[PDB]
Amino acid sequence: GQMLQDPFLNILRKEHVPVSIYLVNGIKLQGQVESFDQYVVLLKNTVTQMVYKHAISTVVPARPVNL
Amino acid sequence: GQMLQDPFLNILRKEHVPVSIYLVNGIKLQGQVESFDQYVVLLKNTVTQMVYKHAISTVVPARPVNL
Amino acid sequence: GQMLQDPFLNILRKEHVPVSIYLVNGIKLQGQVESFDQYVVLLKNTVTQMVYKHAISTVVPARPVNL
Amino acid sequence: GQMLQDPFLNILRKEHVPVSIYLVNGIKLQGQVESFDQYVVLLKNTVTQMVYKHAISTVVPARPVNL
Amino acid sequence: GQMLQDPFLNILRKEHVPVSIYLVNGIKLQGQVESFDQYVVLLKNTVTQMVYKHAISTVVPARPVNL
Amino acid sequence: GQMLQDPFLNILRKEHVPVSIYLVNGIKLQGQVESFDQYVVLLKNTVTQMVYKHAISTVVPARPVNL
């Protein structure tokens, strides 16, 4: 397919879907996708942290999300 | 060879082949390839999660798949 | 979204926000973002060290920072 | 040198040389190089799995192979 | 900021500043930056070894260095 | 500096310098640089194996080598 990353992240952002983000170092972060760009995802919980996409292994939504 | 990634992923998607996806952090995910683009594979089980290709080490189909 | 990395890093730099930077090898660095470019973040504590972005997993500010 | 990757992989494929492929996560895969493209190597044993090159550390042939 | 990596490495090289270089695999190398290019840093101790930047997580000087 | 990787690898190859190559997964390989290209180094011991540069952390010669 083509151009599927952004629609997926954008539903998670607009719909405030709780996600777990598994990093390449084994950290699992939880929160809401506040925003994202070419290279980073801003993930919001107690604060907003800037997660580099190159360190993300998988983004797991708390519920089914259909593109 | 040339342009073999997409034909492989596309048989797995169209034919709903069960796969195991081994990540660079040791996680093994199981499910069906729902869709994919330049950078991500959407993998469906209980939910659909967005797996970044840069974190995938190998995609192992449950059965032989011939391109 | 678009062009969000730099605004985020730039608030952290200009506002001297304490950050924790989690590396892909599990090291957690703490300090202030002194400066940054396409590829590196200069992080200042006792000395200034040059952190490659490709090794950063997440930048966690000590407080909420809103872009 | 220049353009040595493909000649090497191509001898392994055409000559059906048994290889061990060591991944960045410590997995060692064994089999035959069925095919490869810009980004993936298809490795055949009981099934054919799609190995991303970015996750390969070294390809070790079972015997000397001279380019 | 822009074009800060090279000025930093260049002060370390010209001023023969002792550095520790932390790699993504946990190795910590110590020595002096002899030279560097787009992709590698030559680090000199008993011998000169060629460190790929993509494997460096952070370069820590023994003393403050101000760009 | 500029264009230093290839001169370094080329002295190691032409001069048959024994090297240790440390991979991002902790494997240490030993042998001689037989050849190399944009993306791989062919390393020769009992056989020749194809090491991807993206998995190399540092190349350590057995002796001083001066570019």
JSON list of C-alpha atoms in Angstrom, two decimals, chain B residues 1-5 8-9 22-26 41 53-65 67, chain D residues 6 10 13 23-25 27 29 34-40 42 44 46-55:
[
{"chain": "B", "resi": 1, "resn": "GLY", "atom": "CA", "xyz": [16.82, -9.35, -7.69]},
{"chain": "B", "resi": 2, "resn": "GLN", "atom": "CA", "xyz": [14.53, -6.31, -7.71]},
{"chain": "B", "resi": 3, "resn": "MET", "atom": "CA", "xyz": [11.18, -5.30, -6.20]},
{"chain": "B", "resi": 4, "resn": "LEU", "atom": "CA", "xyz": [10.60, -8.49, -4.20]},
{"chain": "B", "resi": 5, "resn": "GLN", "atom": "CA", "xyz": [9.60, -7.05, -0.80]},
{"chain": "B", "resi": 8, "resn": "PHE", "atom": "CA", "xyz": [6.03, -11.01, -0.76]},
{"chain": "B", "resi": 9, "resn": "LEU", "atom": "CA", "xyz": [4.11, -8.79, 1.66]},
{"chain": "B", "resi": 22, "resn": "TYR", "atom": "CA", "xyz": [10.49, -10.90, 14.89]},
{"chain": "B", "resi": 23, "resn": "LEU", "atom": "CA", "xyz": [11.50, -7.45, 16.08]},
{"chain": "B", "resi": 24, "resn": "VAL", "atom": "CA", "xyz": [15.01, -6.14, 16.75]},
{"chain": "B", "resi": 25, "resn": "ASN", "atom": "CA", "xyz": [14.15, -6.07, 20.48]},
{"chain": "B", "resi": 26, "resn": "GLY", "atom": "CA", "xyz": [13.20, -9.76, 20.61]},
{"chain": "B", "resi": 41, "resn": "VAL", "atom": "CA", "xyz": [3.31, -2.84, 8.27]},
{"chain": "B", "resi": 53, "resn": "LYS", "atom": "CA", "xyz": [9.85, -1.89, 9.15]},
{"chain": "B", "resi": 54, "resn": "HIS", "atom": "CA", "xyz": [13.15, -0.59, 10.56]},
{"chain": "B", "resi": 55, "resn": "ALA", "atom": "CA", "xyz": [12.38, -2.60, 13.70]},
{"chain": "B", "resi": 56, "resn": "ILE", "atom": "CA", "xyz": [11.52, -5.84, 11.88]},
{"chain": "B", "resi": 57, "resn": "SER", "atom": "CA", "xyz": [14.23, -8.47, 11.59]},
{"chain": "B", "resi": 58, "resn": "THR", "atom": "CA", "xyz": [12.35, -11.23, 9.75]},
{"chain": "B", "resi": 59, "resn": "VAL", "atom": "CA", "xyz": [8.81, -12.07, 8.64]},
{"chain": "B", "resi": 60, "resn": "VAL", "atom": "CA", "xyz": [8.17, -15.83, 8.92]},
{"chain": "B", "resi": 61, "resn": "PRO", "atom": "CA", "xyz": [5.01, -17.18, 7.21]},
{"chain": "B", "resi": 62, "resn": "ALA", "atom": "CA", "xyz": [3.24, -20.17, 8.71]},
{"chain": "B", "resi": 63, "resn": "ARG", "atom": "CA", "xyz": [3.48, -21.95, 5.36]},
{"chain": "B", "resi": 64, "resn": "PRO", "atom": "CA", "xyz": [5.52, -21.86, 2.15]},
{"chain": "B", "resi": 65, "resn": "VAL", "atom": "CA", "xyz": [4.80, -18.81, 0.01]},
{"chain": "B", "resi": 67, "resn": "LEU", "atom": "CA", "xyz": [6.95, -15.47, -5.38]},
{"chain": "D", "resi": 6, "resn": "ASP", "atom": "CA", "xyz": [25.11, -8.30, -5.15]},
{"chain": "D", "resi": 10, "resn": "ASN", "atom": "CA", "xyz": [24.17, -13.88, -6.27]},
{"chain": "D", "resi": 13, "resn": "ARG", "atom": "CA", "xyz": [21.76, -17.84, -4.56]},
{"chain": "D", "resi": 23, "resn": "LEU", "atom": "CA", "xyz": [20.73, -10.86, 13.02]},
{"chain": "D", "resi": 24, "resn": "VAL", "atom": "CA", "xyz": [21.23, -7.76, 15.15]},
{"chain": "D", "resi": 25, "resn": "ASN", "atom": "CA", "xyz": [19.04, -9.38, 17.84]},
{"chain": "D", "resi": 27, "resn": "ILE", "atom": "CA", "xyz": [19.05, -14.85, 16.06]},
{"chain": "D", "resi": 29, "resn": "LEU", "atom": "CA", "xyz": [19.06, -18.21, 10.67]},
{"chain": "D", "resi": 34, "resn": "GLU", "atom": "CA", "xyz": [16.30, -17.80, -2.58]},
{"chain": "D", "resi": 35, "resn": "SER", "atom": "CA", "xyz": [16.32, -14.19, -3.81]},
{"chain": "D", "resi": 36, "resn": "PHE", "atom": "CA", "xyz": [17.03, -10.67, -2.64]},
{"chain": "D", "resi": 37, "resn": "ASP", "atom": "CA", "xyz": [16.32, -7.06, -3.55]},
{"chain": "D", "resi": 38, "resn": "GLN", "atom": "CA", "xyz": [17.35, -3.57, -2.41]},
{"chain": "D", "resi": 39, "resn": "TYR", "atom": "CA", "xyz": [16.07, -4.14, 1.11]},
{"chain": "D", "resi": 40, "resn": "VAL", "atom": "CA", "xyz": [15.30, -7.83, 1.83]},
{"chain": "D", "resi": 42, "resn": "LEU", "atom": "CA", "xyz": [14.40, -14.20, 1.02]},
{"chain": "D", "resi": 44, "resn": "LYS", "atom": "CA", "xyz": [14.54, -20.62, 2.37]},
{"chain": "D", "resi": 46, "resn": "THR", "atom": "CA", "xyz": [11.19, -25.19, 5.81]},
{"chain": "D", "resi": 47, "resn": "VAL", "atom": "CA", "xyz": [9.51, -22.01, 4.56]},
{"chain": "D", "resi": 48, "resn": "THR", "atom": "CA", "xyz": [10.81, -18.86, 2.91]},
{"chain": "D", "resi": 49, "resn": "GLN", "atom": "CA", "xyz": [11.12, -15.95, 5.31]},
{"chain": "D", "resi": 50, "resn": "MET", "atom": "CA", "xyz": [11.75, -12.33, 4.42]},
{"chain": "D", "resi": 51, "resn": "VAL", "atom": "CA", "xyz": [14.81, -10.97, 6.26]},
{"chain": "D", "resi": 52, "resn": "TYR", "atom": "CA", "xyz": [15.37, -7.21, 6.20]},
{"chain": "D", "resi": 53, "resn": "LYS", "atom": "CA", "xyz": [18.98, -6.37, 5.38]},
{"chain": "D", "resi": 54, "resn": "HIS", "atom": "CA", "xyz": [19.04, -3.62, 8.03]},
{"chain": "D", "resi": 55, "resn": "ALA", "atom": "CA", "xyz": [18.70, -6.39, 10.63]}
]
